[model samples]
Target: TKFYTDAVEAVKDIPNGATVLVGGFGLAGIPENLIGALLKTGVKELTAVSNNAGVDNFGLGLLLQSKQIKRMISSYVGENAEFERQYLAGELEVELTPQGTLAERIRAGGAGVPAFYTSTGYGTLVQEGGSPIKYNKDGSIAIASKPREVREFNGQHFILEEAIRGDFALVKAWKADQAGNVTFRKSARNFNLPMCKAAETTVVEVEEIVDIGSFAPEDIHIPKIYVHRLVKGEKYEKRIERLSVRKEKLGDNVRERIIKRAALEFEDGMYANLGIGIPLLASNFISPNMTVHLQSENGILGLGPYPLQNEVDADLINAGKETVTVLPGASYFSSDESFAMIRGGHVNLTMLGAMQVSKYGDLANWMIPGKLVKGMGGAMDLVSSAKTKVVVTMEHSAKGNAHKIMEKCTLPLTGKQCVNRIITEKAVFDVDRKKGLTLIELWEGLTVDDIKKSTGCDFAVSPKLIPMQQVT
Candidate 1:
């Protein structure tokens, strides 16, 4: 019958040194009970494949606390200090694949594909090599990724990434029947569906286990064939890693003003991805009549406004880990498909905040060495496609008055020659691949001289300069 009421019993058969695929993007959709039960078994030397290593004191962190995980193949580990400590101390091996590539690798493994080509990380260290996977105890490189094969297709370049599979998959679901047909609710469906099919044995912990006929044919997200074991989870913490509280009205501030100007870039029927911080607030200024489908890298499209306090669900969160609602006709999938839309050029616009944007259309926003090391989750892939309009939204200068609009980026690069437009609190600029940067608009009361003084790059004034827009 493939049903068990005890999570500990379901996970008891897993052996040491096994490779495991875990289902979750952040804390959502995690098999908490199974992870806890796996810890009870005291198995060591596990290799975990997941989107993000869970935050400190939760999710996969439980396993990490016991030093059970020897390696992690994941996209981001920014939430866990223990993970960083272990990786830097040479106790854990880390393979930090780009989010989209990680998703595709799992999907390909499940689909029986050996490898695939992607443009997501072609020119970066992901392809050219030397991204640190493990460091020596003395701060030297112990293990680093090697260069990948690159090929040219139709004047574009793509690097080959191999498929990945696991011996066991531990996942969480909203519902599962006696026969193990599974269904997931909202954005919680991220990664769980694909992980179910990418492993030799899959164990699922669900909120409810109903009769075999309980779910309609259209409602079943994963067929029973892929599921080998099912356990009814007793109590779930369902923690919100980050919260985006719903607001009645946005106040007039530099961040809001930047977001207001950024929102004007969205046109009807456009598909857009908004980065965190100032880019997230742009959603508040979007007109009601526009039919823009907001895409989040954590595997959701048609993103709605932030959920009200009463309406908040821990399982439903965006890429920024903020709780959110979904618009009508919203669709859910894995990160593989989400990035496929972005890298395939199906997405029309992406507005993201940046630390620095150069006149050559280079962007540096993901990291600052020796200070911050949050792995680049989706920024590289989001800005990779030339067909998508990459708009950099940020303040004109740093809080210390350092120019963000610069002749060249000093921080690590997210993407090269990708930015199409730049929107800031002081002015707006257009970036051209050949002509460099041009000032196209200015905020009210701000003169051309004001922009030039605030900007580090030399630029040309637009013949048709206009005032920055404000929403009614």
Candidate 2:
């Protein structure tokens, strides 16, 4: 028979200092009761494999405040002051992973892919002191002559990466039948599925419990065979990191006004992925009736808008270090597991800030012109995977250079032909799937001819060009 119990009772058997894997990206679908149970157990010296350590006063943050966890294996660290304090004070051990690699590691471990290779961490801190391996044309590794010989790939070099596994897996699901079959509402489907298979014991919490076979076969995202236990919880709190605003006039402080103006873009019931810069402003703009789902590459899903001052939870921040809240169905997991969702094309919509967008819909967001660039972090995966991709930014750079209508991106390309729409203060443009950019709207002060004149590449006017409407 299937095992069933309350979340606290279900996790009561966990011992102190266990290695655990969590599910969710931020707070969407996380098993809050189970986490609370783990907290109540007073489990200290835990080895946590997750995206971010939860915020300071809640989520993983609560555990951090309790001084229960001794080690963390994750990708990003945002706004959790206690976590930062522990890390800075040398009281905590952290093993950071490349967001994409971390996701793949969990999936690889579960899928039996063993260890695979990638070019993501070749020359940075991610590759320090690792054995390099060489490969033939067929992608098989060459036998090493010495320890150093194992550190090269192709004609260049690569490090040997090992797969990671955990003891217990904690996940969140939208609904679960008594038999453990699970259904995820939206982006919550990302990491939770793979993480279930990566851990030895898996526990899932659901918003509602139903009888077996109540869900359609095709609609079941995670099979019941993978899940071990289930609990039901209601009334979840969602969170956000930072709030940005933009103003229409420069009469007041431009930065404050810009943040205010930017806040107006958030809409209820939207699936949004907030990128760095102005795109992050949408979290503060959410309407009371609207429920926006925030996703981050660090493995949080079902994120609410920016938290109010009195209700702020430090553990719930986005990839960019802004405070956030967790929704009723929130969840968390390793950044490694989180990126699999991004790379697997599970996200509904992604809001990205860009340096430039080409007429061909190529995105340039990773590298600035003069700065030594770090590699792309989830941007490439999001652009390539999200069902609907939106770019939000100014029409021009601060140097009076147009960024919207470039011939080709001078910066490194994040993804090719991936952008679906462009939103700027001046206008909006739709990027046709195969035909490139088509101007769809213009600002009140601008004409089609004016837009064309300022653009560096060819663009066609959409036959149905209309006045731009605010994204209520």
Candidate 3:
């Protein structure tokens, strides 16, 4: 039978008050056709599990508008104003999960692991009302005397969370064969495969469908047995979260300044991923004659920089929570697809901002001393997989602490020996993969000793250390 069917016809059998798992990372990899079909069936009181509610008018946001979902199980609460409104008005019930734990729980459910212990949500609200068990020295926890008993660790108590299994799992795949064997193209692989296992019935929407036995078993990330229903769709609207502009001076003409800086890093046909902060500004710098593809972990490609004021789409944003726009030849898929591109080493360069960089090229971006922490979004993947890595930041943090040269990172390491170049207002340093650090150039009027004093670690000044000259 053809995989093409109206979404309503496929899911009309799903009863109201059913537990459903929807696979997505942000808005990427959402089963758009299935969502539309579910809406048409007028299914109500859904207990929906997903990463986040879609934007105000798209993705799961459509369900929120229909008031079809009675409860939402998710992690990040983004800028979906409608979700906030319904949640606050007491019209919807919400259960927030830790991002890492949520992803792992789905994976564990499918892998046949009854339960796996993790620290991701041990101390947060995710632990509330769950049974707390005690761990032995080896990190193994004693089985709870009672099913709902809580677990204790390091003098603290944590609750055991039962695995969640859903009635229907809705997912999106980039390509699928008639038999339902699937290939998720990149970051789009995020939550889809796991959800397929956690639900009794799984439905997949594909951008393209192929004949059976077309894909090699080795290439198949998700097996056919996990999939039950399949559909095909046309175009996808992948959105960006934010658009940021950098200013040499933060007044007027910031746009021109942003364009100039972006041009310095991006070339005519560079494949790049922008990290948060100033690296995100590079998107605005692409020259019209040159095309720079932008990627994010939330799963989007052919991404342009931010849109012009009159053309902004609120649904199009980056991982940093900034609004963005897609250029021509752009395509949107699951974050699982985006991550594949990253893990598969398809990107040319990844530019990121840094809090501190050690002499050995270790990057510390996730947490810093005396600061509240934001979890690592995708820095780990980019650093480990990108062919070339660059970091941009001031020579020193605002408090005059040397952020560029640290003896040891106060923050956790994102990746070891993963950075290639360090760009700072004062100078540029090429991280020597073998010898630790090699000073490429010093800012005008700065001496080698001056750079050394500023750094907390010992440095071996290149025998060729010289003053930085302007690029001609």
User: TM-score: which candidate is best?
Assistant: 1
Instruction: Assess every candidate by TM-score.
Output: 0.93, 0.56, 0.58
Model 2 lDDT-worst window of ten: 141-150
Show the colliding residue pairs in model 1: none
Worst 10 residues of 1 by lDDT: 244-253
Q: Give the Å shift of residue 64 in candidate 1.
A: 1.1
lDDT, model 2, position 459:
80
What is the alpha-carbon lDDT of model 2 when measured against the actual structure?
0.64
lDDT value, residue 324 of candidate 2: 56
List the global CA lDDT of all models. 0.87, 0.64, 0.65
* Cα lDDT of model 1 by residue, 139-164, tens digit: 88888789999999999888999998
True-structure Cα RMSD, model 1: 2.2
Q: What is candidate 3's lDDT per residue for 163-189, written digit by digit as tens?
A: 768888888878888888888754556
Q: Rank the models by lDDT, top first.
A: 1, 3, 2
